Design an enzyme around this catalytic site. Structure first.
Site, mmCIF file in Angstrom:
data_model
loop_
_atom_site.group_PDB
_atom_site.id
_atom_site.type_symbol
_atom_site.label_atom_id
_atom_site.label_comp_id
_atom_site.label_asym_id
_atom_site.label_seq_id
_atom_site.Cartn_x
_atom_site.Cartn_y
_atom_site.Cartn_z
ATOM 1 N N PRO A 23 -48.953 -61.237 50.689
ATOM 2 C CA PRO A 23 -48.444 -59.933 51.074
ATOM 3 C C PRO A 23 -46.919 -59.854 50.908
ATOM 4 O O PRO A 23 -46.181 -60.808 51.278
ATOM 5 C CB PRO A 23 -48.868 -59.803 52.542
ATOM 6 C CG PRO A 23 -48.931 -61.226 53.028
ATOM 7 C CD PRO A 23 -49.515 -61.984 51.841
ATOM 8 N N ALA A 57 -47.646 -56.054 54.486
ATOM 9 C CA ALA A 57 -47.663 -55.639 55.913
ATOM 10 C C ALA A 57 -47.771 -54.135 56.013
ATOM 11 O O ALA A 57 -46.880 -53.398 55.682
ATOM 12 C CB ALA A 57 -46.455 -56.154 56.668
ATOM 13 N N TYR A 183 -43.352 -61.357 64.298
ATOM 14 C CA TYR A 183 -43.789 -59.985 64.582
ATOM 15 C C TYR A 183 -44.637 -59.990 65.857
ATOM 16 O O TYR A 183 -44.598 -60.961 66.618
ATOM 17 C CB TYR A 183 -44.467 -59.369 63.332
ATOM 18 C CG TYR A 183 -43.492 -59.245 62.191
ATOM 19 C CD1 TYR A 183 -42.273 -58.579 62.365
ATOM 20 C CD2 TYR A 183 -43.778 -59.795 60.944
ATOM 21 C CE1 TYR A 183 -41.359 -58.488 61.340
ATOM 22 C CE2 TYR A 183 -42.882 -59.700 59.908
ATOM 23 C CZ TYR A 183 -41.674 -59.063 60.104
ATOM 24 O OH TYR A 183 -40.794 -59.019 59.071
ATOM 25 N N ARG A 231 -53.011 -64.480 59.333
ATOM 26 C CA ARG A 231 -51.883 -65.242 58.856
ATOM 27 C C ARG A 231 -51.114 -65.701 60.104
ATOM 28 O O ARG A 231 -50.830 -64.901 61.006
ATOM 29 C CB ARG A 231 -51.001 -64.384 57.951
ATOM 30 C CG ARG A 231 -49.968 -65.199 57.201
ATOM 31 C CD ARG A 231 -49.201 -64.450 56.111
ATOM 32 N NE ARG A 231 -48.875 -65.320 54.966
ATOM 33 C CZ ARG A 231 -47.887 -65.115 54.071
ATOM 34 N NH1 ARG A 231 -47.050 -64.105 54.203
ATOM 35 N NH2 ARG A 231 -47.713 -65.949 53.024
ATOM 36 N N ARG A 325 -42.838 -64.814 45.680
ATOM 37 C CA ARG A 325 -41.713 -64.617 44.781
ATOM 38 C C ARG A 325 -42.011 -64.968 43.328
ATOM 39 O O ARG A 325 -41.527 -64.256 42.429
ATOM 40 C CB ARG A 325 -40.509 -65.394 45.260
ATOM 41 C CG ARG A 325 -39.867 -64.750 46.479
ATOM 42 C CD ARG A 325 -38.827 -65.630 47.144
ATOM 43 N NE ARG A 325 -39.473 -66.746 47.819
ATOM 44 C CZ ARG A 325 -38.847 -67.622 48.600
ATOM 45 N NH1 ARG A 325 -37.542 -67.517 48.795
ATOM 46 N NH2 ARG A 325 -39.533 -68.593 49.207
HETATM 47 C C1 LIG Z 1 -40.048 -59.194 49.124
HETATM 48 C C2 LIG Z 1 -40.929 -59.966 50.072
HETATM 49 C C3 LIG Z 1 -41.783 -59.294 50.926
HETATM 50 C C4 LIG Z 1 -42.591 -59.996 51.830
HETATM 51 N N1 LIG Z 1 -43.436 -59.300 52.691
HETATM 52 C C5 LIG Z 1 -44.302 -59.995 53.469
HETATM 53 C C6 LIG Z 1 -45.340 -59.285 54.214
HETATM 54 O O1 LIG Z 1 -45.466 -58.083 54.067
HETATM 55 N N2 LIG Z 1 -46.113 -59.975 55.022
HETATM 56 C C7 LIG Z 1 -46.023 -61.313 55.123
HETATM 57 O O2 LIG Z 1 -46.812 -61.946 55.888
HETATM 58 N N3 LIG Z 1 -45.124 -62.086 54.407
HETATM 59 C C8 LIG Z 1 -44.302 -61.441 53.565
HETATM 60 N N4 LIG Z 1 -43.393 -62.193 52.776
HETATM 61 C C9 LIG Z 1 -43.444 -63.621 52.819
HETATM 62 C C10 LIG Z 1 -44.314 -64.004 51.593
HETATM 63 O O3 LIG Z 1 -45.684 -63.548 51.742
HETATM 64 C C11 LIG Z 1 -44.343 -65.538 51.393
HETATM 65 O O4 LIG Z 1 -45.007 -66.128 52.529
HETATM 66 C C12 LIG Z 1 -42.938 -66.132 51.246
HETATM 67 O O5 LIG Z 1 -42.145 -65.360 50.339
HETATM 68 C C13 LIG Z 1 -43.022 -67.572 50.764
HETATM 69 O O6 LIG Z 1 -43.745 -67.696 49.544
HETATM 70 P P1 LIG Z 1 -43.027 -67.722 48.114
HETATM 71 O O7 LIG Z 1 -42.174 -68.957 48.219
HETATM 72 O O8 LIG Z 1 -44.219 -67.872 47.213
HETATM 73 O O9 LIG Z 1 -42.203 -66.443 47.953
HETATM 74 C C14 LIG Z 1 -42.575 -61.485 51.867
HETATM 75 C C15 LIG Z 1 -41.697 -62.141 51.026
HETATM 76 C C16 LIG Z 1 -40.897 -61.433 50.151
HETATM 77 C C17 LIG Z 1 -39.968 -62.246 49.280
#
Ligand SMILES: Cc1cc2nc3c(=O)[nH]c(=O)nc-3n(C[C@H](O)[C@H](O)[C@H](O)COP(=O)(O)O)c2cc1C
Lengths: 369, 371
Positions: A23, A57, A183, A231, A325
């Site tokens: 997400p 989210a 949250y 989560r 990312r």
């Molecule tokens: C732009 C952005 C938006 C995100 N929005 C959410 C979200 O809506 N809900 C959530 O649980 N985590 C959110 N995250 C965390 C990501 O789901 C993920 O757990 C975190 O970026 C680590 O993984 P990655 O290293 O693959 O980016 C977000 C991260 C980024 C960078």
């Protein structure tokens, strides 16, 4: 001998591979309504060949938004706007579409990250009154949330139910309850945020009580055959805060209560968090949760390379690899992983001509006769 | 000393860098109308950080479509459907948006690639009668096109004009007139397809006449400040067809008639072949057209690596490089190129956190904070 490109399953939902798009808030909605941004963004994510898409989210109420431009599912307009997006996605992809339902608690009423992410006070034009287990702020000097009372907690339960029903009606295939990242539910779990002295604070059982009621409410409301999970943040990275033992205990309860999976992240409840960041830094938490509880376990965090992802699955460290990312930076990440690891993916016919010569099996069903 | 990530300009149209997204047929329209696919696809392309987006071959009339699902701009509905896509682009991207106006000529009334690309006969479902300079099919055993008469040629001129005015009203910033890929204009250019005996066939001047009439009509109709140019095939692979000499003569005429550029297709010689021959230019025909004519020269680059594109620019082979397949397989190609070449790109704020750990300052003016 498990592999990244094995087909997999969460509950009754069959997944084409073990790759999930985590997400990712876009902060691009208007009064909770999906906009053209979401058709472009989710549309492209759906072309990626990942098995699973977890929508950002999505607020269960206006006051539960992180920011004024969060995606919402708290009224008919929100439902219709998201439905338009989903129609486009289903027209061009077979991906499993699921949604993260959320409530920001005291971390609500914030700016978008590109605007510095600061609190917007309730007295300011876009700001609003926030709610939490206790009337203590996330960071010193912020306008504090109000401590939730019985009717406030009921409203939240009922809002999660109402949003889960709208999601079901939209044909969404699964619900991830957001219990992480500082949250609302995480606020109840962590003694950093939860200073309550009723049955919803103090002991571990008390701190888990409201997050589990919310889970139960969603699981009851959403069609039984479609998966519902949570989560979690496995640790606060703050001494005496929430930790892996709380997480394991919560995960056992989730399993007993019919959760399909656990998606394992960390952090978010305290500016004091001392996070040790690095590739796969949160994989050890997923490994332990998978080992001790045995639900399908999703791992996430700086997983960027195909062989790294494959190694996590091969080492029985997680069942699903969640990527955020790296998907934004390469929305064809699963195509590219499949090319490296000798696998295939679903891709839209418009793009079948696109892969280099030598990868004639990369795209399932592709043909030109 | 030019580089891939230097700003550039075509007419009055400023470009963020020398990367153009090539017009790539999507075969995903309904009676010429853009669909949700075009929103998703053109939205990605527009957020890539390239300097220039060129929308796919857009039919000036239904009969001028390559296939029954080509994009069109030949009626109000077509205009409205494309306008919906463009409005989303404008909400989110600073990219320059241009469009390739097209007529398939004898290659019209064909199937999409996934359906085998074959001719659909005029008497089959979805098929139609095709038009061309002469009644000669592209391949033996196909239904031949009708040889155009004075009225048919006027309809085509006027259809190009009508579509150019619709594009202007949509706020499209430039027009590429499609003179390549064996489509209608190329059919006039080429002695292989053009066996006319009037003032439109025979000599080189006669063969360029109708393509130049169309270009002139488009240039007259489209707002003078916005660029209009042509796409030209460098050469045919066969003798007694179109050739590099024709391309050069046509490019001189385009320049004298107020073309903003020329976009030079590869003539069938890829970089893998070309770099082994002579000075070893990757785009030798584009190199020569640039050197001899001096128009802004866009070259089709059948390349995948940043270093390949940089070299085309730095070696003065082209001023703008158009990229097709690598953009489909990596819609963030310009971000990935900028990372390799030490440059920066415009990326939407929603994706600013995507920057890998390694890199810093990839995205222009990015900011972040969180509670
Ligand atoms: C732009 C952005 C938006 C995100 N929005 C959410 C979200 O809506 N809900 C959530 O649980 N985590 C959110 N995250 C965390 C990501 O789901 C993920 O757990 C975190 O970026 C680590 O993984 P990655 O290293 O693959 O980016 C977000 C991260 C980024 C960078």
């Amino acid at each position: 001998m498990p592999h990244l490109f094995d087909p997999y399953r969460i509950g009754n939902l069959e997944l084409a591979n073990r790759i999930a798009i985590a997400p990712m808030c876009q902060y691009s909605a208007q009064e909770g309504n999906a906009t053209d941004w979401h058709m472009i963004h989710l549309g492209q994510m759906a072309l990626s060949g990942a098995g699973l898409l977890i929508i950002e989210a999505t607020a269960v109420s206006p006051e539960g938004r992180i920011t004024p431009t969060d995606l919402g599912l708290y009224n008919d307009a929100n439902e219709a706007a998201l439905g338009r997006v989903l129609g486009a996605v289903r027209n061009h992809s077979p991906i499993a579409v699921t949604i993260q339902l959320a409530h920001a608690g005291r971390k609500a009423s914030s700016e978008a990250p590109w605007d510095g992410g600061g609190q917007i006070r309730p007295d300011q034009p876009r700001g609003w009154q926030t709610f939490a287990p206790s009337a203590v702020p996330h960071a010193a000097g912020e306008v504090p949330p109000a401590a939730l009372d019985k009717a406030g907690m009921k409203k939240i339960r009922d809002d999660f139910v109402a949003a889960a029903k709208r999601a079901a009606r939209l044909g969404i295939e699964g619900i991830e309850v957001h219990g992480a990242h500082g949250y609302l539910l995480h606020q109840f779990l962590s003694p950093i945020a939860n200073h309550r002295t009723d049955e919803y604070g103090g002991s571990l059982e008390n701190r888990m009580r409201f997050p589990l009621e919310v889970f139960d409410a969603v699981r009851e409301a959403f069609p039984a055959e479609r998966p519902v999970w949570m989560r979690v943040s496995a640790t606060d990275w703050v001494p005496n805060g929430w930790d892996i033992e709380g997480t394991i205990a919560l995960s056992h309860e989730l399993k007993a209560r019919g959760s399909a999976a656990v998606h394992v992240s960390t952090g978010g409840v305290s500016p004091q968090q001392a996070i040790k960041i690095g590739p796969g830094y949160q994989v050890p938490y997923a490994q332990r949760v998978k080992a001790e509880v045995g639900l399908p376990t999703m791992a996430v965090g700086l997983i960027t390379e195909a062989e790294q992802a494959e190694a996590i699955i091969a080492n029985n460290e997680a069942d699903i690899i969640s990527i955020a990312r790296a998907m934004l930076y390469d929305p064809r990440w699963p195509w590219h992983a499949a090319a490296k690891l000798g696998a295939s993916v679903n891709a839209p016919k418009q793009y079948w001509r696109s892969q280099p010569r030598g990868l004639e099996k990369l795209f399932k069903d592709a043909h030109f006769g």
